[PDB]
Amino acid sequence: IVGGYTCGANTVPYQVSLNSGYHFCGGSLINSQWVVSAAHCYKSGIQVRLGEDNINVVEGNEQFISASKSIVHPSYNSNTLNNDIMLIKLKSAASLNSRVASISLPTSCASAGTQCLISGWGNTKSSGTSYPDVLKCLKAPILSDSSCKSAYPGQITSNMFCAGYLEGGKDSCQGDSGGPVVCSGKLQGIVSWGSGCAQKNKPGVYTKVCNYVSWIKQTIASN
Numbered sequence: 001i002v003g004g005y006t007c008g009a010n011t012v013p014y015q016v017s018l019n020s021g022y023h024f025c026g027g028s029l030i031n032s033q034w035v036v037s038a039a040h041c042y043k044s045g046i047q048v049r050l051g052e053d054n055i056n057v058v059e060g061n062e063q064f065i066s067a068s069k070s071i072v073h074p075s076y077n078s079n080t081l082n083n084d085i086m087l088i089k090l091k092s093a094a095s096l097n098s099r100v101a102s103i104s105l106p107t108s109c110a111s112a113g114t115q116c117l118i119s120g121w122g123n124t125k126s127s128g129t130s131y132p133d134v135l136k137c138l139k140a141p142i143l144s145d146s147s148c149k150s151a152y153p154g155q156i157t158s159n160m161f162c163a164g165y166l167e168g169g170k171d172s173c174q175g176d177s178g179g180p181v182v183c184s185g186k187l188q189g190i191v192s193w194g195s196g197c198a199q200k201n202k203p204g205v206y207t208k209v210c211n212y213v214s215w216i217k218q219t220i221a222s223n
């Protein structure tokens with residue numbers, strides 16, 4: 001997260017770190033046995049780490065669970081990143097409490113101007129690599145579809161939206177992929193891609209979750 005602030009320990013209780021010996025992507029807990037992340041974060045040997053703040057120190061509240069299976073959207077396109085969403089089933093259910101909690105799926109899509117919270121352990125420099133130990137947060141608005149399409153001509157599908165600042169300075173960055181974009185307490189986006197980090201006129205692009213709720217529900221109901 002570039003230009004964000006320190007969230008504060010466990011203030012984003014649905015945030016998870018996908019780990020394979022190091023943190024490589026974020027995710028969101030949507031119930032006690034399932035996480036939602038980005039399809040391009042897929043790999044084997046994923047350990048989901050819940051209740052984290054400093055990902056390099058065990059401070060208490062952490063729950064480390066292995067993924068039993070990861071379901072990449074069947075229509076995921078790695079060249080366009082269209083349908084960049086993945087569901088992860090946990091080996092055992094997580095113990096939910098005030099520090100580990102799930103976030104709700106939306107009933108409707110959000111409107112441009114809606115302010116959302118983006119969090120993660122990704123890079124905090126636009127020009128360079130600085131990875132934080134604790135969770136960072138950024139409040140950012142969803143942009144209109146015209147500004148998004150005008151920024152990334154030919155690359156935005158109906159399953160994506162832009163959120164961010166066109167002046168630059170604040171944005172999600174590498175290490176944040178797969179994590180949550182929460183607006184009014186509902187998960188509206190998943191960190192997906194962008195051109196650099198916090199560059200002027202190149203906002204971040206997110207996966208539009210409101211378009212996959214029946215898919216998430218039917219898939220979870222059959223697995």
Ligand SMILES: NC(=[NH2+])c1ccc2[nH]c(-c3cccc(-c4ccccc4)c3[O-])nc2c1
Pocket residue numbers: 024025040041042171172173174175176177191192193194195196197198203204205
């Ligand atoms: N500017 C942005 N809003 C942004 C957001 C998420 C990103 N994630 C990445 C990213 C960059 C290099 C590699 C990966 C990657 C590739 C495979 C697996 C996991 C991460 C990224 O997610 N760049 C990103 C840029």
Ligand SMILES: [Ca+2]
Pocket residue numbers: 052053054055056057058059060062
């Ligand atoms: Ca920790």
Ligand SMILES: [Cl-]
Pocket residue numbers: 149153154155
């Ligand atoms: Cl277009």
